[PDB]
């Protein structure tokens, strides 16, 4: 998979347009293959058009949390869902807590077209 199709698969859900059921993360972490080998401790889904998300790569350039400088912060807050493992999880069967939030996202961008390949953070 290209890094861009992997970002869409791990972090984009343009159809929700917010996580209204708290069963959402349990059934989207599985749906997007994030529980195939182990429990991914944390992951964020973005509920905006892909045009709104890809357009973040031309907005405020900020520093990636690992030191790199090709990360970008969104102009307006975006609808996101934080998936977090509960205290009761473990990998046969992964259990996740769902939190709907409206935050700005930060992504690392690459390529032509210049698009998000890593999800860095929320503010």
């Amino acid at each position: 998979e290209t890094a861009a199709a992997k970002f869409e698969r791990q972090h984009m859900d343009s159809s929700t347009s917010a996580a209204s059921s708290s069963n959402y993360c349990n059934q989207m972490m599985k749906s997007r293959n994030l529980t195939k080998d182990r429990c991914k401790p944390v992951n964020t889904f973005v509920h905006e058009s892909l045009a709104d998300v890809q357009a973040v790569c031309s907005q405020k350039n900020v520093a990636c949390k690992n030191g790199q400088t090709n990360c970008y912060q969104s102009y307006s807050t975006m609808s996101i869902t934080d998936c977090r493992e509960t205290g009761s999880s473990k990998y046969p069967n992964c259990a996740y807590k769902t939190t709907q939030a409206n935050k700005h996202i930060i992504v690392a961008c690459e390529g032509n077209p210049y698009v998000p390949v890593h999800f860095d953070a929320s503010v």
Partner: nanobody
Amino acid sequence: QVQMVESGGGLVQAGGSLRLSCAASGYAYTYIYMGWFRQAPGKEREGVAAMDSGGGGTLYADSVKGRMTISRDKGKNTVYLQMDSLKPEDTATYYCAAGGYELRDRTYGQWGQGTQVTVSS
């Protein structure tokens, strides 16, 4: 829309000197990293020099350190390449790029149209 604006290239004798200027206008913030890449006829595109918005993070390609000097207006979206002692192998189109990391080609999403530099022997 972010206009990339380059100038300073053209024809120059071997052992000669040139100064490339590049400015990104219409960007509401400050590209942390900007730099120069170059491509020749046939040769694949390669990195030349790169510098961060503080004045640090300075990096040159192993083929041009000592002959070439990057600089930026601190905090501003401008980048300059002073080239001295020029060889015929420096002949190439020089591209200004903004918003990536070091000389990592895939990480910049802003590229200028390119400034032709030709160095006769």
